[PDB]
Amino acid sequence: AQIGFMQPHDNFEANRGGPFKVPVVPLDITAGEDHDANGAIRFNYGKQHGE
Amino acid sequence: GGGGIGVSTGTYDNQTTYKFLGDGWVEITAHASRLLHLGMPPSENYCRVTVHNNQTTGHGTKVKGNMAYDDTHQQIWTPWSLVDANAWGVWFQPSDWQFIQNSMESLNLDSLSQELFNVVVKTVTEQQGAGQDAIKVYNNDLTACMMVALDSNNILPYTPAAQTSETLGFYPWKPTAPAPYRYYFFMPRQLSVTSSNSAEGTQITDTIGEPQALNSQFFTIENTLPITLLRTGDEFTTGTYIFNTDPLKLTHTWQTNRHLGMPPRITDLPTSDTATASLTANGDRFGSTQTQNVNYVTEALRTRPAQIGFMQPHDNFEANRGGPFKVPVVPLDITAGEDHDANGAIRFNYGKQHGEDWAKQGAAPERYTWDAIDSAAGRDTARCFVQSAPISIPPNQNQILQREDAIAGRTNMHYTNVFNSYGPLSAFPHPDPIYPNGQIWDKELDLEHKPRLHVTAPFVCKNNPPGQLFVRLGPNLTDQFDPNSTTVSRIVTYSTFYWKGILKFKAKLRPNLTWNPVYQATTDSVANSYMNVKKWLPSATGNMHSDPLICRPVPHMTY
Amino acid sequence: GGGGIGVSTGTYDNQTTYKFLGDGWVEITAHASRLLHLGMPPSENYCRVTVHNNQTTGHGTKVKGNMAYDDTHQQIWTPWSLVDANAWGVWFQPSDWQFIQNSMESLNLDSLSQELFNVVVKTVTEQQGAGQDAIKVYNNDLTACMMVALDSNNILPYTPAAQTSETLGFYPWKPTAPAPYRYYFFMPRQLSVTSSNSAEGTQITDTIGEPQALNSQFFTIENTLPITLLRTGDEFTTGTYIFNTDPLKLTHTWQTNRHLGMPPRITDLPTSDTATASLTANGDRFGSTQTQNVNYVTEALRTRPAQIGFMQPHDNFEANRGGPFKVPVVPLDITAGEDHDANGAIRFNYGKQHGEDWAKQGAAPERYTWDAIDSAAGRDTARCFVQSAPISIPPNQNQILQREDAIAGRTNMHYTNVFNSYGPLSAFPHPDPIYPNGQIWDKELDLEHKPRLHVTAPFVCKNNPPGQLFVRLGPNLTDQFDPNSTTVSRIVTYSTFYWKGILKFKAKLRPNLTWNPVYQATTDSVANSYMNVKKWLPSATGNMHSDPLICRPVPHMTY
Amino acid sequence: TNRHLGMPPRITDLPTSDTATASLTANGDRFGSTQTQNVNYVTEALRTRP
Amino acid sequence: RPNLTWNPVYQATTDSVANSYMNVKKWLPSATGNMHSDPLICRPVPHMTY
Amino acid sequence: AGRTNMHYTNVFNSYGPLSAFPHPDPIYPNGQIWDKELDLEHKPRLHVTAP
Amino acid sequence: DWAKQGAAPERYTWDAIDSAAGRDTARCFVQSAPISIPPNQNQILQREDAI
């Protein structure tokens, strides 16, 4: 079988509600360090939450 | 006592009953009864028939670019006819559909039973009067029979008549006819791909093949099915079929990926009713995105649980041993861009029996385009775009791919044509039930990997579909008969009979939790309005017409 | 309740069912239902009718050498007609036959039952219109009857319709007709033997005699059988007949006398794949022969357990009080020499009802030559020879008798024509079942010494055959009737009715013990191939044709 | 294939000879459903399939 | 398998034709005992999808 | 389409019947533990934001 | 085949017996919406076109 798969990036689809980036299954960025391709998550938080 | 020519073998019931069981559950029993007509087949033979549109002119397939006009196929033509009740308009009044759409959250199939009764066979005789005007005489043939076959095991190719608009009529007081039964037969079909700009020296390959041993299946009703013979006192019953199917939502979803989850916090409330609130600067704002190149969070870049709707290739034509065909498309919201082919809007063609206006003249059928009621899962293609990683906001022209861009140097080809965004994260609603003209249920393809849904019907039977019901008139033979001759002489004969059927449903009344009033399906008195009641009322001369009614008027919350 | 003109008295079932009982045993129930037609006899009398072909020219029997054209006989012509279901093509689809031939080692008859139902009698009336064109009017005669007689005791001469190709049609959706019943009546028949070289002064004795007291038997249906009268609400059943018969092998034998027993030992194995091994010199080799004059053993001279196949006289014409007839021949492999008459290949002639191509034009029937599937028991006549004892190897011309030698000074006469090698050691397989056109079962001759087999059918009934089923329309009389007059005036009348029958079989699935794959009966897509599927499929206009299918594709080991 | 699914279109008449090819009701007049709305006709290639 | 068709069905069979892929000589030993086994067709009989 | 930085890998979707991949990784401290399922007839195989 | 000589292995290409689900690629094409029949060269994408 196929382990992992290619994913469109950075895909922006639009509906009656405006443009949005299509989410991406988080996967290994490998050696090429491809984040958007493999869906690395970048989150932003304050001191209450561990800043 | 038990039988005779002068007693009726069944009752005419076309009324729809509502049984309210409690806890909001509704048993809906739809009775439908129709006067059915039958006539002798043009031939008593099984015929293996080819259609080939190599006309070199007009719409023919030897003209460059007409690939999508291909009708080429081959079929087994049978003397048998098909009684097919599967459409919504058979089973409900326009008001019944309204009451279910407004008051019910969900709907599901329960059971089906069918009957044939009061068979009448007549023969036609010429009678010669003065003035060289022959009048027809109509005589009961009391001993004549009608042949009836039910396929319970679904041995025969499954052949829904709703897709050709051949189902029983939608008007209970109008006589109707069964459809002549036919099924595809494998034929090799090869057709080249050309455009109207193709070179003049180009030769189009348009070819059909000979029957193939590995693919050839010829079935006959007589060898595969038990056949009942109905004389005028005889009656036929299919028994009761039990549906095993998934319930159908009578509500639609409005939420897109922009509408999922926690909205961002507004800094302050608006100052006036015309004012617009602001958010914490995107550089300072909490949240998560899957684009790391930029250090900010925006409503468009926020990570969402999943993908609502997906992009679909259009208009995709794939070819096999059987010729070119357009790949079907999941019906979805055409949105604001009014993208039909992209989102798979269905356009169906039908006649007066099925709700075309009777006052309308000409051979042209009534045409209607059904757009999905769902406003969540569609895709506006002009507003879609793709950017390169690492994401650069704003992108330059080389860093973005947008619909005006030409694929393979073809002006009107855009990546959105070949782009398939379907994946593990895609989530969308089921196809919408279409009234009157839509197919209620459908057979499941027999393959190891089955599709998630069918485009053409809301309900798919989990094991075996209801059996198809076949009828024909037998040969009525004259005194001159040679069994070794090819040409039979037979008496002119036709029959009429009554079909009744009973279709049961499980419905559940909808909850009302909103403050604001809800969108409902209503008729109006406004002139030229689509919902003007004059359309659902008879005319002066009795002309009827029934137009598609909205379904799923009430929204529900996706998440 | 129990009867009436408006109810059906039976059901149409023509489907074939397979019941797998376990341990490889299969119950095969073949249902067959056919719309049957009947019409008034040309005469209501029993007629004693003579055919005499003394035409002096053409094919007549007063021409020298035309002895084998003799049709001369005498028959009782009866007003009754015969419903005869005995042929293979009545009971099976071409695919059913394939599945039995590929998957089954053996087959045997179990039971037979028959029914007649939905009798419809109509009268024809002339109706005079303008233009001197009379149109026919078709009216139900509700009180008219059809006469039905079953002979369970087999009093009447047994008259298989498969041999004249008069059985019911092979196509379930095509109307068919019963055969008019007739039986031979003893007449003296004397015909001289001449050749085309016979002297001009030669007088041919061609003579028929008067009825003979010792041999005369005239039977009538009415005096010998109970007769049921069927009106339109009446139904008729034969009950269930039970076959007592020997099973039939669905496999064929390849082993000749050269293939029996221990092969001789090879000295060494071959050196290469193209090499041929050698045996110990025949003078030194162990073994036994029945020729003592020579002191050596060869594969041809080895003593074998028995004789597989035997020589048969051909073409033998024996004469009795009833005229010349060709002696039948056990069907056997025509081998490589393609010797048909020697090995008894059967050539049968049939019409479109029975599987001639419907597209074919002309009065000429379809002709087919059936060769036995067995490759063991045949006899290549050109390769046969006889040598004198004490055996001299090599023989001179006087010590050997070979096929080119002329018997009685007649160039084309050879000893193989008159040579009968049948004896206590002869062993051969049973005649092969022929589909569709072959006869399934047959009556046993009533004589004290019975033949080992019949040529024309696989199954012979051990005690009594299934009863023959007779039908006729009675006289429909006008108002003018004189019982003392010879000329009756009667109403033009015909009937239609449905015949159904149920034929059960015991089959057993075949063992598979070989390494190599086995020969199977398969259709192919190759153009002009005999097995091309296009032959078993309908045409564009609905033309069908069914051609003989191979039987016994799988070999088994004789010894 | 997808061309072989469902109800075939009705032939106007049966073929005249075994070499003849039957015709269908003109695609502009023919009943059926497609997912391409820009054109007002139904063809075997454009028919909606399950 | 059930047999419901009128026409005969495609079967997997060996043949005697020279150079044919299904020629029995391939499934038989040679003079020196050489064997070879080649892929055999599977699924010769069709069934109806829909 | 003659766009220097656009590559087929941007629009390429290899997902198919043969694709096999693990579930999204639980993120501590900041990750969401559980999530509601979307109410739709065809549901996604996973959510990106929660295990 | 045992009679065969050399170190080269036996090679065989298995084609699926299924005649339903395949895809003839030269005969496949994509057209632009709104569909124009017949398309001009810019309104159709066919296999001879270069990506």
Side-chain angles (χ1 to χ4, degrees):
Chain A
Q2 188 182 359
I3 295 170
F5 59 96
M6 296 295 291
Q7 288 168 326
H9 59 283
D10 287 343
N11 186 11
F12 292 91
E13 295 176 352
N15 298 0
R16 295 183 180 277
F20 59 87
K21 181 174 175 289
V22 176
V24 172
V25 175
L27 294 175
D28 184 57
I29 63 170
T30 62
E33 294 177 350
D34 292 342
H35 310 272
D36 294 348
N38 291 283
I41 296 169
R42 185 173 181 82
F43 53 89
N44 294 281
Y45 58 91
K47 293 178 178 179
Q48 189 176 357
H49 295 87
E51 180 182 2
Chain B
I5 62 171
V7 295
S8 295
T9 57
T11 64
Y12 182 93
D13 188 2
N14 207 304
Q15 61 185 17
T16 297
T17 308
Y18 296 89
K19 182 70 178 296
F20 296 98
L21 316 170
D23 290 344
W25 289 99
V26 180
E27 181 180 2
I28 296 170
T29 300
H31 296 83
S33 297
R34 296 288 155 64
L35 176 63
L36 266 302
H37 175 90
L38 183 63
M40 76 195 90
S43 177
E44 295 175 352
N45 293 337
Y46 290 88
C47 298
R48 181 174 63 88
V49 176
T50 300
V51 174
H52 194 195
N53 46 351
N54 50 304
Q55 315 305 118
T56 299
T57 58
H59 296 164
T61 46
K62 295 297 284 186
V63 198
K64 292 178 294 296
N66 283 349
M67 302 171 286
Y69 289 108
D70 181 66
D71 288 342
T72 306
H73 64 287
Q74 190 167 357
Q75 66 183 25
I76 300 299
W77 184 92
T78 64
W80 291 85
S81 293
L82 180 65
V83 177
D84 187 2
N86 186 26
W88 290 100
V90 175
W91 297 96
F92 296 106
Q93 286 174 327
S95 65
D96 289 344
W97 183 255
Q98 187 183 1
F99 176 77
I100 295 169
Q101 295 302 319
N102 287 340
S103 296
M104 302 295 179
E105 62 181 341
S106 64
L107 180 64
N108 194 28
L109 291 173
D110 185 3
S111 63
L112 177 63
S113 64
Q114 291 174 332
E115 294 177 351
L116 299 175
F117 60 92
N118 286 342
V119 176
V120 174
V121 177
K122 291 182 180 297
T123 58
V124 178
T125 302
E126 297 302 320
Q127 185 67 261
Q128 186 63 60
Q132 292 177 334
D133 290 344
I135 61 172
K136 292 178 177 178
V137 175
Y138 296 117
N139 290 336
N140 289 337
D141 187 1
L142 295 176
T143 58
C145 57
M146 177 179 72
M147 298 176 74
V148 176
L150 176 64
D151 186 3
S152 63
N153 295 336
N154 288 283
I155 293 168
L156 297 173
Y158 185 78
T159 300
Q163 298 303 320
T164 57
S165 178
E166 295 177 353
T167 38
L168 298 176
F170 296 162
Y171 300 94
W173 59 94
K174 301 301 285 186
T176 188
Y181 177 78
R182 58 223 181 243
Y183 60 89
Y184 291 97
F185 183 82
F186 177 81
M187 175 180 71
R189 171 55 178 162
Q190 184 88 241
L191 176 60
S192 292
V193 175
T194 57
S195 64
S196 64
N197 294 131
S198 295
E200 182 65 14
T202 299
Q203 295 296 100
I204 294 170
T205 299
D206 173 359
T207 57
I208 59 172
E210 296 303 321
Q212 297 301 318
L214 288 94
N215 298 285
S216 294
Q217 288 179 330
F218 166 66
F219 297 96
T220 86
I221 306 298
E222 291 81 356
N223 284 282
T224 58
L225 295 176
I227 296 170
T228 299
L229 299 175
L230 296 179
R231 288 184 177 175
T232 188
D234 290 343
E235 182 276 337
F236 179 80
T237 35
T238 61
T240 300
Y241 173 81
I242 303 301
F243 290 98
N244 191 29
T245 324
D246 290 342
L248 176 64
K249 291 186 176 76
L250 295 179
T251 58
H252 66 283
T253 57
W254 60 273
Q255 289 181 334
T256 63
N257 286 129
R258 295 294 296 275
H259 300 87
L260 295 177
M262 180 74 79
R265 296 183 66 182
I266 59 173
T267 298
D268 289 344
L269 293 173
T271 59
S272 64
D273 286 343
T274 58
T276 174
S278 295
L279 299 174
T280 72
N282 60 348
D284 291 343
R285 187 186 300 173
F286 297 160
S288 65
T289 62
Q290 287 179 332
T291 58
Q292 74 165 22
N293 192 33
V294 297
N295 288 359
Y296 47 84
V297 283
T298 62
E299 183 70 7
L301 293 175
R302 289 178 61 183
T303 301
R304 299 292 183 186
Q307 188 182 359
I308 295 170
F310 59 96
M311 296 295 291
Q312 288 168 326
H314 59 283
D315 287 343
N316 186 11
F317 292 91
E318 295 176 352
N320 298 0
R321 295 183 180 277
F325 59 87
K326 181 174 175 289
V327 176
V329 172
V330 175
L332 294 175
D333 184 57
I334 63 170
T335 62
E338 294 177 350
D339 292 342
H340 309 272
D341 294 348
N343 291 283
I346 296 169
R347 185 173 181 82
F348 53 89
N349 294 281
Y350 58 91
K352 293 178 178 179
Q353 189 176 357
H354 295 87
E356 180 182 2
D357 189 3
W358 298 358
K360 185 177 179 180
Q361 294 299 320
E366 183 66 15
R367 314 177 183 295
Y368 182 80
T369 300
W370 181 261
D371 292 341
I373 305 302
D374 166 68
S375 73
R379 287 301 175 243
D380 191 356
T381 60
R383 304 289 185 266
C384 295
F385 61 93
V386 177
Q387 295 180 340
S388 62
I391 186 167
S392 295
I393 300 168
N396 62 35
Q397 64 178 19
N398 289 335
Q399 292 175 334
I400 185 169
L401 182 64
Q402 63 185 20
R403 190 186 70 191
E404 65 182 343
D405 293 343
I407 299 301
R410 299 298 181 192
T411 302
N412 289 284
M413 290 295 105
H414 308 296
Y415 72 94
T416 60
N417 292 129
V418 293
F419 178 77
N420 179 295
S421 65
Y422 179 76
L425 296 174
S426 296
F428 54 93
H430 236 214
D432 307 0
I434 297 169
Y435 177 83
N437 294 126
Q439 182 175 353
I440 299 171
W441 63 87
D442 192 3
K443 182 181 178 181
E444 67 185 345
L445 297 172
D446 188 3
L447 291 171
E448 185 64 17
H449 295 290
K450 293 183 172 73
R452 297 293 294 296
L453 61 81
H454 297 170
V455 174
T456 58
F459 299 100
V460 176
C461 298
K462 291 175 180 175
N463 293 131
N464 198 32
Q468 289 177 331
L469 179 62
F470 300 99
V471 295
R472 64 174 293 177
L473 292 175
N476 215 59
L477 295 176
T478 62
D479 54 301
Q480 296 299 320
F481 177 78
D482 185 4
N484 294 358
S485 65
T486 187
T487 299
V488 297
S489 179
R490 56 177 182 181
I491 297 169
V492 175
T493 301
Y494 68 94
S495 66
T496 59
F497 59 93
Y498 290 90
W499 174 87
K500 180 174 76 179
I502 298 169
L503 182 62
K504 290 182 180 296
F505 294 93
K506 297 293 172 54
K508 188 178 173 63
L509 295 169
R510 65 181 183 89
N512 190 32
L513 296 170
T514 58
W515 176 262
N516 59 341
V518 175
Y519 182 82
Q520 296 290 97
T522 188
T523 193
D524 64 11
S525 296
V526 177
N528 290 336
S529 177
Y530 179 80
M531 290 296 181
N532 189 337
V533 63
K534 185 178 179 181
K535 292 165 62 181
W536 288 273
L537 299 173
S539 66
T541 59
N543 292 335
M544 295 299 294
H545 68 88
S546 58
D547 281 346
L549 294 175
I550 187 168
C551 57
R552 291 178 177 172
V554 179
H556 65 283
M557 188 65 71
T558 301
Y559 179 76
Chain C
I5 62 171
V7 295
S8 295
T9 57
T11 64
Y12 182 93
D13 188 2
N14 207 304
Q15 61 185 17
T16 297
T17 308
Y18 296 89
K19 182 70 178 296
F20 296 98
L21 316 170
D23 290 344
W25 289 99
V26 180
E27 181 180 2
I28 296 170
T29 300
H31 296 83
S33 297
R34 296 288 155 64
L35 176 63
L36 266 302
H37 175 90
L38 183 63
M40 76 195 90
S43 177
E44 295 175 352
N45 293 338
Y46 290 88
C47 298
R48 181 174 63 88
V49 176
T50 300
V51 174
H52 194 195
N53 46 351
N54 50 304
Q55 315 305 118
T56 299
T57 58
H59 296 164
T61 46
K62 295 297 284 186
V63 198
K64 292 178 294 296
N66 283 349
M67 302 171 286
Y69 289 108
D70 181 66
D71 288 342
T72 306
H73 64 287
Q74 190 167 357
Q75 66 183 25
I76 300 299
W77 184 92
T78 64
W80 291 85
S81 293
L82 180 65
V83 177
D84 188 2
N86 186 26
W88 290 100
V90 175
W91 297 97
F92 296 106
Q93 286 174 327
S95 65
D96 289 344
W97 183 255
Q98 187 183 1
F99 176 77
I100 295 169
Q101 295 302 319
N102 287 340
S103 296
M104 302 295 179
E105 62 181 340
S106 64
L107 180 64
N108 194 28
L109 291 173
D110 185 3
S111 63
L112 177 63
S113 64
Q114 292 174 332
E115 294 177 351
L116 299 175
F117 60 92
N118 286 343
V119 176
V120 174
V121 177
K122 291 182 180 297
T123 58
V124 178
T125 302
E126 297 302 320
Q127 185 66 261
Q128 186 63 60
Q132 292 177 334
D133 290 344
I135 62 172
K136 292 178 177 178
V137 175
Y138 296 117
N139 290 336
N140 289 337
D141 187 1
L142 295 176
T143 58
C145 57
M146 177 179 72
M147 298 176 74
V148 176
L150 176 64
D151 186 3
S152 63
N153 295 336
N154 288 283
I155 293 168
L156 297 173
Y158 185 78
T159 300
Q163 298 303 320
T164 57
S165 178
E166 295 177 353
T167 38
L168 298 176
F170 296 162
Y171 300 94
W173 59 94
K174 301 301 285 186
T176 188
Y181 177 78
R182 58 223 181 243
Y183 60 89
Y184 291 97
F185 183 82
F186 176 81
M187 175 180 71
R189 171 55 178 162
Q190 184 88 241
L191 176 60
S192 292
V193 175
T194 57
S195 64
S196 64
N197 294 131
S198 295
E200 182 65 14
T202 299
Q203 295 296 100
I204 294 170
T205 299
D206 173 359
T207 57
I208 59 172
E210 296 302 321
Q212 297 301 318
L214 288 94
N215 298 285
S216 294
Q217 288 179 330
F218 166 66
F219 297 96
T220 86
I221 306 298
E222 291 81 356
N223 284 282
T224 58
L225 295 176
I227 296 170
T228 299
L229 299 175
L230 296 179
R231 288 184 176 175
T232 188
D234 290 343
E235 182 276 337
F236 179 80
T237 35
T238 61
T240 300
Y241 173 81
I242 303 301
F243 290 98
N244 191 29
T245 323
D246 290 342
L248 176 64
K249 291 186 176 76
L250 295 179
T251 58
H252 66 283
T253 57
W254 60 273
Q255 289 181 334
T256 63
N257 286 129
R258 295 294 296 275
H259 300 87
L260 295 176
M262 180 74 79
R265 296 183 66 182
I266 59 173
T267 298
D268 289 343
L269 293 173
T271 59
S272 64
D273 286 343
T274 58
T276 174
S278 295
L279 299 173
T280 72
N282 60 348
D284 291 343
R285 187 186 300 173
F286 296 160
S288 65
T289 62
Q290 287 179 332
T291 58
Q292 74 165 22
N293 192 33
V294 297
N295 288 359
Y296 47 84
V297 283
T298 62
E299 183 70 7
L301 293 175
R302 289 178 61 183
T303 301
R304 298 292 183 186
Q307 188 182 359
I308 295 170
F310 59 96
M311 296 295 291
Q312 288 168 326
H314 59 283
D315 287 343
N316 186 11
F317 292 91
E318 295 176 352
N320 298 0
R321 295 183 180 277
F325 59 87
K326 181 174 175 289
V327 176
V329 172
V330 175
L332 294 175
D333 184 57
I334 63 170
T335 62
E338 294 177 350
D339 292 342
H340 309 272
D341 294 348
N343 291 283
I346 296 169
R347 185 173 181 82
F348 53 89
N349 294 281
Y350 58 91
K352 293 178 178 179
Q353 189 176 357
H354 295 87
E356 180 182 2
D357 189 3
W358 298 358
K360 185 177 179 180
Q361 294 299 320
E366 183 66 15
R367 314 177 183 295
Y368 182 80
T369 300
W370 181 261
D371 292 341
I373 305 302
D374 166 68
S375 73
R379 287 301 175 243
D380 191 356
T381 60
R383 304 289 185 266
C384 295
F385 61 93
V386 177
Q387 295 180 340
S388 62
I391 186 167
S392 295
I393 300 168
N396 62 35
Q397 64 178 19
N398 289 335
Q399 292 175 334
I400 185 169
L401 182 64
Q402 63 185 20
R403 190 186 70 191
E404 65 182 343
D405 293 343
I407 299 301
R410 299 298 181 192
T411 301
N412 289 284
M413 290 295 104
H414 308 296
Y415 72 94
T416 60
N417 292 129
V418 293
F419 178 77
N420 179 295
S421 65
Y422 179 76
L425 297 174
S426 296
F428 54 93
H430 236 214
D432 307 0
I434 297 169
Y435 177 83
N437 294 126
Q439 182 175 353
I440 299 171
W441 63 87
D442 192 3
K443 182 181 178 181
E444 67 185 345
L445 297 172
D446 188 3
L447 291 171
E448 185 64 17
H449 295 290
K450 293 183 172 73
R452 297 292 294 296
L453 61 81
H454 297 170
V455 174
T456 58
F459 299 100
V460 176
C461 298
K462 291 175 180 175
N463 293 131
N464 198 32
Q468 289 177 331
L469 179 62
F470 300 99
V471 295
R472 64 174 293 177
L473 292 175
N476 215 59
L477 295 176
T478 62
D479 54 301
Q480 296 299 320
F481 177 78
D482 185 4
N484 294 358
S485 65
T486 187
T487 299
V488 297
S489 179
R490 56 177 182 181
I491 297 169
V492 175
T493 300
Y494 68 94
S495 66
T496 59
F497 59 93
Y498 290 90
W499 174 87
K500 180 174 76 179
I502 298 169
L503 182 62
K504 290 181 180 296
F505 294 93
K506 297 293 172 54
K508 188 178 173 63
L509 295 169
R510 65 181 183 88
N512 190 32
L513 296 170
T514 59
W515 176 262
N516 59 341
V518 175
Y519 182 82
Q520 296 290 97
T522 188
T523 193
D524 64 11
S525 296
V526 177
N528 290 336
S529 177
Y530 179 80
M531 290 296 181
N532 189 337
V533 63
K534 185 178 179 181
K535 292 165 62 181
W536 288 273
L537 299 173
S539 66
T541 59
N543 292 335
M544 295 299 294
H545 68 88
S546 58
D547 281 346
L549 294 175
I550 187 168
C551 57
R552 292 178 177 172
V554 179
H556 65 283
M557 188 65 71
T558 301
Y559 179 76
Chain D
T1 63
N2 287 129
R3 295 294 296 275
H4 300 87
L5 295 176
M7 180 74 79
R10 296 183 66 182
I11 59 173
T12 298
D13 289 343
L14 293 173
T16 60
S17 64
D18 286 343
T19 58
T21 174
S23 295
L24 299 174
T25 72
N27 60 348
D29 291 343
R30 187 186 300 173
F31 296 160
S33 65
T34 62
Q35 287 178 332
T36 58
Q37 74 165 22
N38 192 33
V39 297
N40 288 359
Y41 47 84
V42 283
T43 62
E44 183 70 7
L46 293 175
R47 289 178 61 183
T48 301
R49 299 292 183 186
Chain E
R1 65 181 183 88
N3 190 32
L4 296 170
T5 58
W6 176 262
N7 59 342
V9 175
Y10 182 82
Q11 296 290 97
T13 188
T14 193
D15 64 11
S16 296
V17 177
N19 290 336
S20 177
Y21 179 80
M22 290 296 181
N23 189 337
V24 63
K25 185 178 179 181
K26 292 165 62 181
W27 288 273
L28 299 173
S30 66
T32 59
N34 292 335
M35 295 299 294
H36 68 88
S37 58
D38 281 346
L40 294 175
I41 187 168
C42 57
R43 292 178 177 172
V45 179
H47 65 283
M48 188 65 71
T49 301
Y50 179 76
Chain F
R3 299 298 181 192
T4 302
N5 289 284
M6 290 295 105
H7 308 296
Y8 72 94
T9 60
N10 292 129
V11 293
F12 178 77
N13 179 295
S14 65
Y15 179 76
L18 296 174
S19 296
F21 54 93
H23 236 214
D25 307 0
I27 297 169
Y28 177 83
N30 294 126
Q32 182 175 353
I33 299 171
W34 63 87
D35 192 3
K36 182 181 178 181
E37 67 185 345
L38 297 172
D39 188 3
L40 291 171
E41 185 64 17
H42 295 290
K43 293 183 172 73
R45 297 293 294 296
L46 61 81
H47 297 170
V48 174
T49 58
Chain G
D1 189 3
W2 298 358
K4 185 177 179 180
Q5 294 299 320
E10 183 66 15
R11 314 177 183 295
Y12 182 80
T13 300
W14 181 261
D15 292 341
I17 305 302
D18 166 68
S19 73
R23 287 301 175 244
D24 191 356
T25 60
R27 304 289 185 266
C28 295
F29 60 93
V30 177
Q31 295 180 340
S32 62
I35 186 167
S36 295
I37 300 168
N40 62 35
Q41 64 178 19
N42 289 335
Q43 292 175 334
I44 185 169
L45 182 64
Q46 63 185 20
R47 190 186 70 191
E48 65 182 343
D49 293 343
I51 299 301

